[PDB]
Amino acid sequence: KKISGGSVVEMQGDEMTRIIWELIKEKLIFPYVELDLHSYDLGIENRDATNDQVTKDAAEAIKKHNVGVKCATITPDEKRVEEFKLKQMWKSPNGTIRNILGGTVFREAIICKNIPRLVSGWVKPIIIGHHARATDFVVPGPGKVEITYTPSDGTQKVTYLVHNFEEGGGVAMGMYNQDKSIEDFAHSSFQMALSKGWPLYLSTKNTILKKYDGRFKDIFQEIYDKQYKSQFEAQKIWYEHRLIDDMVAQAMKSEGGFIWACKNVAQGYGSLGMMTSVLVCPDGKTVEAEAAHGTVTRHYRMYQKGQETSTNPIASIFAWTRGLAHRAKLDNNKELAFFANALEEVSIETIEAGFMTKDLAACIKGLPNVQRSDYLNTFEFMDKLGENLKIKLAQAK
Template sequence: MECQKIKVANPIVEMDGDEMTRVIWKSIKHKLIFPFVELDIKYFDLGLPNRDATDDQVTVESAQATLKYNVAIKCATITPDEARVKEFNLKRMWKSPNGTIRNILNGTVFREPIICKNIPKLVPGWTKPICIGRHAFGDQYRATDAVIQGPGKLKLVFVPEGHDEKTELEVFNFSGAGGVALSMYNTDEWVYAVYGCSEELHHYQLLKSMKINGNPSLRLPGYWYEHRLIDDMVAYALKSEGGYVWACKNYDGDVQSDFLAQGFGSLGLMTSVLVCPDGKTIEAEAAHGTVTRHYRVHQKGGETSTNSIASIFAWSQGLAHRAKLDGNTRLLDFTEKLEAACIGTVESGKMTKDLALLIHGSKVARAQYLNTEEFIDAVAKELRARLSTKAKL
């Protein structure tokens, strides 16, 4: 007998995506969410063809809707390069949708591993969680770059608002054939935001500039801060037991969160939540890409075994935040059981090929893993069992 659907009072923003993650996204909704939850969804298609058709305005509108409704759940999307421009016959090389959304929301991305007891860690010494706190504003993703065509001086100029004087710094004196240049920025407000969700963990801040690190306004009372250069921090992280927030600049956080995910087991086992400064607005997503290689197989009708756990957790964590904002205990209980069903399914020995390879090695047999849809079906079965147990009690 089916349980009565959980009614959600306020809307959530759904941002659809590209390629293989778009395929599993649809399956997750229809097998793990819609049978149990009655939702008002504000849907935005962030697939690359629609972003091109709307001149990327759909991305801006999805971010604005997130600010209005406070909860967004996002599928992985393509950031086009020259090859993608040609493949999709795009009008132009659109910027990263994540970069556009994050700069409108102005928050901090927190990424943590999803731990399954039977999945071996590549870094076995990590016995405590490590959370990456990553700028979601400025830095490399909003940089201004230029190709220098010949000899000349490159300068950095700052003109204070309301004042005539300006600061002018000479960056480099190009000679000969020229080269390339890049200018990045961030603000005290968004650097500070990285430190707002540390809870009781030790806090490492990884900022190359000692001028930023030395600003006492960027340190909160009651927290233990330690500054390390990023090369030193990577070495330390490998030999540490974990148990800290690792605060990174935007691009560094992107790279190191993949390092973290792989060290704990798999790139498919990583949560990613953008927390806005108001503490009320979040965007949950999978930390990985669109799994193009699997999508090419899927397009040809071949069998795939794509890990959907991070995408499932995007839904669970987004809905959990909706539940907390609304005081919806049934919805919160559902999200906890959905996450437990994912982990329980893997720990029972049912998993996708990427995880089976970690346990059985490169000679893993087909019988030792599930394909894409089989895994989602297994999670759905486990979820129904957990919900049924609660209902009987």
């Protein structure tokens, strides 16, 4: 009865999202999709118990199985180590995973019409895929800061004066970017664009950063022309370098519906529970979907105290739908593909139908005016989603 979704690496996360994860899996995914589940519990405790080995495993697992849907996970800091008596301040599992899988993250603000956007003109969502450490430092007083490139082939070492501080000090920094990374960024971006049939857009400062950002413009254009150009048009889709400036202006002027590859991480005034991240690996096959938000600690605390919480599961639900959608794509799993979509549709519809969590209700009536009667609580919204998903899916088969 259920549809074999195939193998999917699922990563359990922490706190509120972990609570929602089980609801999403319980109400929205399991009842309709059978999955060869490579479930890894990236719960903060389990990452501790397993010395973060589980994070690396879930990574190698995603590397292996191409599809990773990840629940928000606590990234340990001073407080976390203290709260969980962590044997260590573990690296962000995202960092670990992202470093293992490489790839470019793509945050899509999933948009409901009755939900105010930065630009109410964006009926089509905007997929922003950011690129990526920088070497900043002292400079206490006068002296030359020179950035130096020494070829490994022992040919002439190149020295660029980045600045000669004569008066007082200041601060300097080195940044770099491997062609490889720019290429990955390119492929992940073109890949992502084709994936959603939406036009790609590389925004850089090709002008002020001639050699540097130009390298992106070039590499992108080069990977596009010699790898995706035909593939694009053959979809009405099209890539195009846009100066950060003309690009930000274009977006506001646009109704959205385009992939935006940035080259400079919260920002944005839209609801966090509607922000879906997707680590699109260059290979075009590996993908890791996850809510862009975190474990929603504040909500969890409330949940811990037995208080009514109104956490938005959409970003997590969409992590599932995006991963599953990708699973489907990879496996030509047209039933799973439809389900991923149906679930995305049902999620948006449920919200566009007036049923939402407090945060969304707050996007509409402003926090101060949000009444208990304006939103459903976490469980209530989840149920609603399930009911409609049940409905939506019945309407097909």
